[PDB]
Design a protein around this ligand. Structure first.
Ligand SMILES: N[C@@H](CCCC[NH3+])C(=O)O
Ligand SMILES: [Cl-]
Ligand code: NA
Ligand SMILES: [Zn+2]
Length: 524
């Protein structure tokens, strides 16, 4: 268990205290108390025995149980999220429905209930209800009622925080989100969250991501981000959203493929994380999130893309830098910079909003996601990473970035390929990185030394290689070419021998990070 815990390097998550006066301190304190309740709620959402298992580990005298508790705390359950939820306590497999559904309820019984009781479909499929067996029936119990005890205390902490919040947009959001916990309707407070302006505390708290529900991907998990907004860095990102049409017109495709029906633009903010809780804190840590998922909000006001700068700093120092030291030639190692890591994530997120979407295939109105089917996510993340380099090169052309940043782009991404791929080559993001590495290696844009076991950028072919792969992925999307998407993945999204060799060199490094929050040492 000592080595499994070592996969997450302990790192201290600190924040700038000078950004908060006395009254903002009391906001963050009460926001922290509500976020710790999100830790308790989500722990119950993962598995019904989580609280009972935690209590057994707490009272146990076995020194081995205290090591199992440390990994339990990391994973919010007895299942190893780095290894397909393999239980490290006992051997009972994790329910596919976590704790949102009865463990003996299949998809068939669920779908058979909605056929016999059509009136329950809106409540049963809702992101904010749990399914339970009662009196020979299946009932949908809203989150506001199933977790009323926790959410009432969490709402009171939000109400107390709102009294100390002098920023009107912040005060309004905290008040409405407090009510949202109890009336189970998060739409009005989601809109207030998108309207946060001229504020320091960038905070989001509530149920959002549905990826814990591995039965239907229906139910959302409670989580929290408490971050501090950075005006100097968020200002530098205000011009990137002004280049959105320019980046699209500049894409390496015929004009008929270029998409100016992309929908509402997303606001983007660079923040310093103070505390995270719930779904996001389990296992691997988030570098940036994109909320809300409500299409009703994303149509009206878009979604907010929040970049966690200090989490990037932790991952760069603990992971990307040690990986680059082992995978790159010494002459290219200095080109690995924090700017190359953080600014790619910025442009990776921007690039998701570019490229084909609503398309016409054989005269029918359709979508890239509908046509690519299971290949869409791998192709989409491949597009975002390739365009992230392409558009950052475009930002150099326009004087936004200095010329010496060009080589940092290529090299830092190459080093980052082998941080992402260690998470798993079958995931969409890892699959997309496998394509980029194997394709650019084939083109000669990357080079693998079979004796030194190191990779490098070929600066004479890397620019065209990125353009070539961008053209190919964008064209596959614009034509809805599911067959070419499959063949691209079958050919290049593979664990090639160079990848196997480089991966073997990194077995002793941490996989991710364990957050040790300064605020937890302050408020305890
Ligand atoms: N996006 C993370 C890995 C996945 C985290 C999912 N919550 C990273 O690049 O470090
Ligand atoms: Cl504020
Ligand atoms: Na996580
Ligand atoms: Zn992505």
């Amino acid at each position: 268990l000592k080595r499994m815990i070592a996969q997450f390097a302990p790192t201290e998550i600190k924040y700038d205290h000078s950004l908060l006066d006395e009254r903002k301190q009391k906001v963050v304190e009460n926001l922290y108390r509500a976020a710790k309740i999100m830790d308790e709620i989500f722990l119950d959402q993962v598995y019904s025995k989580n609280f009972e298992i935690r209590e057994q580990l707490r009272a146990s005298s076995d020194p081995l149980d205290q090591l199992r508790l440390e990994y339990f705390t990391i994973m919010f359950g007895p299942f190893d999220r780095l290894n397909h939820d393999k239980p490290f306590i006992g051997n009972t497999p994790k329910p596919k429905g976590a704790n949102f559904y009865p463990p003996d309820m299949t998809r068939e019984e669920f779908e058979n209930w909605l056929k016999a009781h059509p009136e329950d479909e809106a409540a049963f499929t809702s992101e904010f209800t749990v399914i339970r067996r009662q009196d020979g029936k299946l009932v949908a119990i809203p989150y506001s009622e199933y977790y009323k005890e926790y959410l009432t205390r969490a709402a009171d902490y939000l109400k107390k925080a709102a009294e100390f919040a002098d920023n009107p947009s912040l005060k309004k959001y905290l008040q409405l989100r407090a009510e949202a916990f109890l009336n189970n309707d998060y739409y009005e407070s989601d809109l207030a969250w998108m309207d946060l302006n001229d504020h320091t505390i960038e905070v989001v708290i509530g149920p959002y991501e549905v990826y814990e529900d591995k039965l239907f991907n229906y139910k959302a998990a409670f989580e929290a981000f408490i971050t501090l907004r950075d005006p100097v860095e968020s200002a530098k990102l205000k011009k990137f959203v002004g280049y959105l049409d320019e980046m699209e017109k500049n894409l390496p495709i015929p004009d008929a493929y270029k998409n100016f029906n992309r929908g509402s633009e997303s606001p983007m903010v660079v923040v310093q994380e103070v505390f995270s809780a719930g779904d996001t804190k389990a296992g691997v840590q988030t570098l940036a999130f994109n909320l809300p998922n409500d299409e009703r909000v994303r149509e009206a006001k878009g979604s907010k893309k929040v970049m966690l700068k200090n989490i990037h700093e932790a991952k760069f120092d603990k992971l990307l830098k040690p990986i680059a030291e082992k995978v790159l030639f010494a002459e290219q190692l200095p080109l690995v910079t924090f700017e190359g890591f953080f600014n790619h994530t910025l442009m990776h997120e921007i690039s998701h909003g570019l490229g084909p979407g609503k398309i016409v295939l054989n005269g029918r109105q359709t979508e890239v996601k509908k046509e690519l089917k299971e290949t869409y996510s791998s192709i989409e993340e491949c597009k975002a990473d390739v365009l992230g380099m392409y558009n950052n090169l475009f930002m150099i052309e326009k004087g936004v970035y200095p010329p010496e940043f060009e080589k940092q782009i290529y090299v830092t991404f190459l080093a980052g390929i082998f941080r992402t791929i260690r998470f798993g080559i079958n995931e969409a993001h890892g699959a997309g990185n496998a394509v980029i590495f194997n394709y650019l290696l084939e083109k000669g844009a990357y080079q693998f030394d079979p004796a030194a076991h190191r990779v490098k950028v070929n600066f004479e072919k890397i620019k065209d290689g990125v353009r070539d792969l961008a053209n190919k992925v964008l064209t596959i999307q614009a034509q809805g070419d599911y067959m070419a998407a499959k063949n691209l993945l079958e050919t290049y999204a593979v664990e090639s021998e160079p990848i196997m060799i480089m991966r073997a060199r990194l077995q002793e490094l941490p996989v991710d990070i364990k957050p040790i929050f300064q605020i937890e040492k302050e408020l305890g």
